[PDB]
């Protein structure tokens, strides 16, 4: 990825993970802990799990060849959120509001 595009992806993922947005990013900072959350059906429902911490790692390890691949993974976090968490639930609302932060920056 180009240098300026890489810098912008890094700024974007750090913005999404920052404590400034803790109230709506905390469920998405690390892979879903299906044992701690008692959700064995998460792996049966969500076939391509993704989280912000994994995206940050993939970025640092040169696994996004352009910004579009980076965006696809960010969108996947929210797609999985809306699939597993029904509309109206607390985590679903957090996904909507964090994706709005991404839309504004991106
Ligand atoms: C029985 C049940 C129902 C809903 C949830 N949602 C949920 C998720 C979650 C995040 C992303 C995702 O793609 C799927 C689930 N993260 C949490 C956390 C950190 C605390 C409490 C609930 N949480 C957990 C258990």
Author numbering: 384 to 489
Sentences from the paper on this structure:
BET proteins are chromatin-associated factors that regulate transcription and chromatin remodelling. BET proteins bind chromatin through their two BDs (BD1 and BD2), which specifically recognize histones acetylated on lysine residues. The BDs from C. albicans Bdf1 (CaBdf1) share 31–46% sequence identity with human BET BDs and 58–66% identity with those from ScBdf1 and hence are likely to bind multi-acetylated H3 and H4 tails. In conclusion, Bdf1 BDs are required for the viability and virulence of C. albicans and can be selectively targeted by small-molecule inhibitors without compromising human BET BD function.
Similarly, we identified an imidazopyridine compound 2, which inhibits CaBdf1 BD2 with high selectivity: HTRF and ITC assays yielded IC50 and Kd values of 1.1 and 2.1 μM, respectively, whereas human Brd4 BD2 and CaBdf1 BD1 were only weakly inhibited (IC50≥40 μM). Moreover, no significant inhibition of any human BDs was observed for compound 2 by BROMOscan profiling and by an ITC assay on the two most sensitive BDs identified by this screen (SMARCA2 and SMARCA4); while only mild cytotoxicity was observed towards mammalian cells (EC50 ∼60 μM). The crystal structure of CaBdf1 BD2 bound to 2 reveals that the compound forms a hydrogen bond via its amino group with the conserved Asn468 residue, as well as a cation–pi interaction involving the phenolic ring and the partial positive charge on Asn468. However, unlike most BET inhibitors, a water-mediated hydrogen bond with Tyr425 is not observed for 2 (presumably because the ligand dislodges water molecule 1, consistent with the dislodgement of this water by a glycerol molecule in the unbound BD structure; Supplementary Fig. 3d). Instead, the compound's imidazolyl and hydroxyl groups form water-mediated hydrogen bonds with backbone atoms of the Phe-Pro-Phe (FPF) shelf (Pro410) and helix B (Val460). Replacement of the hydroxyl group in 2 by a hydrogen (2a) or fluorine (2b) atom severely reduces inhibitory activity, underscoring the importance of this group for high-affinity binding. The methylpyridinyl and phenolic groups are sandwiched between the FPF shelf and gatekeeper residue Val474 on one side, and residues Val415 and Leu420 on the other, while the tolyl group additionally contacts residues Ile422 and Phe467. A structural alignment with Brd4 BD2 shows that larger Brd4 side chains at four of these contact positions, including signature positions 1,3 and 5 (Trp374, Leu387 and His437) and residue Tyr432, reduces the volume available for compound 2, explaining the inability of 2 to inhibit the human BD. In contrast, the poor affinity for CaBdf1 BD1 is due to smaller side chains at signature positions 1 and 3 (Val232 and Val245), resulting in poor complementarity between the binding pocket and ligand. The selectivity of 1 and 2 for CaBdf1 results from steric incompatibility with bulkier side chains in the human BET BD-binding pockets, particularly at signature positions 1 and 3.
